[PDB]
């Protein structure tokens, strides 16, 4: 029972106004309802387009890190 509920802090609507309000709010709600897991596609990632010095620490902290983050 530990979830955030909608609160009507002020006002005492009757069942009809409550129903209208909830219907409108549900209609307003949207966006990604139950989206699939976002597909990984590292092809042509910006990090791969950079010039790295042969001894650059960013070869570890930026390039390898980006390729390995999962």
């Amino acid at each position: 029972d530990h979830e955030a509920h909608i609160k009507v802090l002020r006002g005492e609507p009757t069942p009809e106004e409550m129903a209208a309000l909830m219907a409108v709010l549900a209609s307003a709600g949207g966006g990604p309802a139950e989206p699939v897991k976002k597909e990984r596609n590292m092809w042509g990632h910006p990090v791969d387009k950079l010039r790295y010095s042969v001894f650059s620490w960013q070869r570890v902290t930026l390039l390898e890190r980006t390729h390995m983050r999962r």
């Binding site: 509920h5 909608i6 609160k7 409550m18 129903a19 909830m22 549900a26 709600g29 949207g30």
Partner: peptide, 24 residues
């Protein structure tokens, strides 16, 4: 899809509200 139950607090009292699950 099935219906869904939201819980709304109106001045401190709990109130259930069942809605179609297809609203979007």
């Amino acid at each position: 899809v099935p219906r869904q139950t939201v819980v709304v607090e109106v001045g401190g009292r709990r109130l259930e509200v069942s809605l179609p699950g297809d609203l979007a």
